[PDB]
Every structure is written in C-alpha cells, then in structure tokens.
Amino acid sequence: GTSKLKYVLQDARFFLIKSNNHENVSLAKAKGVWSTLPVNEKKLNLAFRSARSVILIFSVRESGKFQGFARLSSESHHGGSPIHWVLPAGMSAKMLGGVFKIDWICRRELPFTKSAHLTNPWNEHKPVKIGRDGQEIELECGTQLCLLFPPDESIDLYQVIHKM
Numbered sequence: 001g002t003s004k005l006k007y008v009l010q011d012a013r014f015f016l017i018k019s020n021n022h023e024n025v026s027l028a029k030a031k032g033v034w035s036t037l038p039v040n041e042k043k044l045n046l047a048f049r050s051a052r053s054v055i056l057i058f059s060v061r062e063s064g065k066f067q068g069f070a071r072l073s074s075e076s077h078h079g080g081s082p083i084h085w086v087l088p089a090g091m092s093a094k095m096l097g098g099v100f101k102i103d104w105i106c107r108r109e110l111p112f113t114k115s116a117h118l119t120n121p122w123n124e125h126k127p128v129k130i131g132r133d134g135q136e137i138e139l140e141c142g143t144q145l146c147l148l149f150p151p152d153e154s155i156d157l158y159q160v161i162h163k164m
C-alpha cells in the first residue's frame with residue numbers, strides 16, 4: 001500500500017536531481033549517497049534542517065525518465081569513504097566533495113510520459129520533468145509525482161519513519 005509512503009512525504013520538500021549519466025545514479029542506489037554542486041549543496045543543507053523529509057527525485061539527462069527517489073538522512077559531509085563519481089566535463093571532484101547520506105524510497109523508473117499532467121509552480125508551471133539540477137518542486141506537485149512511481153516492494157519505510 002501507500003500509507004507509510006504518504007506519511008513520509010507529509011510536509012516534505014522535493015528537489016529535482018539531474019545526473020549526466022546512469023553510472024552516478026547506480027552508484028547512489030548501491031551506496032546510499034549523493035553529491036551535488038556547491039550551489040545545490042547549500043540549498044539541500046538548508047532544506048534538511050527546515051523540513052521533516054527532503055526528497056530527491058532523480059533523472060538521468062536524455063533518458064526521458066526518472067530513476068527513483070530518496071530521502072536525505074544527513075546534511076552533506078566531507079572526508080568519508082571516497083565515491084568514484086563520473087565527473088562532468090569541467091572542474092574536478094573537489095566540487096562534488098560534500099556527500100549526503102540518502103535512504104531510497106523507490107528505485108523504480110517512471111517515464112516522463114506519465115508525469116505530463118504535473119506542472120511545477122516554482123518553475124513557471126512548466127512540466128515537472130523540466131528543470132535544472134537542484135530545482136525545487138512545490139509540495140503538491142512533488143507529492144503527486146512521487147505517488148505516480150510504481151511501488152517498490154523491496155523497500156520497508158518503517159526504518160525511515162523512525163529517522164524522522
């Protein structure tokens with residue numbers, strides 16, 4: 001069912017995360033971590049302190065899909081185990097240095113064709129698939145987007161609820 005999912009999403013904040021490649025999303029799904037540009041890292045750290053759940057909704061550029069969504073379980077931290085991200089053309093790993101811990105809520109994909117009816121007020125009411133990396137998604141749009149994903153029966157949200 002969807003009741004624990006709705007509980008986790010209650011009063012949450014939502015951010016669109018754009019990866020240039022599948023490799024980084026696969027690494028994030030395997031290791032429970034994410035890193036972003038410093039401009040976005042500052043926004044996510046502020047959001048983590050301000051809301052009961054901060055949700056990252058992932059999309060690999062040019063894939064036409066979202067690849068899942070996850071909840072921040074920490075602010076960003078440096079000096080942990082290194083993560084072998086595939087780095088965009090220009091600038092090095094010092095940029096992607098802050099590491100957030102995340103708990104996956106859904107590792108299933110959702111094609112953009114299924115979210116065409118959702119627009120994001122914080123991006124000019126453009127379709128929610130449209131947005132830069134780090135674009136915040138308004139509460140109602142983000143909740144409905146997450147509820148469109150196929151259920152991920154491998155996930156138990158009991159442990160996430162306890163972290164709140």
Ligand SMILES: CNC(=O)c1cc(-c2ccc(C)s2)[nH]n1
Binds near residue numbers: 034086
């Ligand atoms: C592990 N993190 C990543 O792959 C990643 C890459 C980005 C980028 C946003 C805008 C770019 C030119 S690059 N934001 N996050």
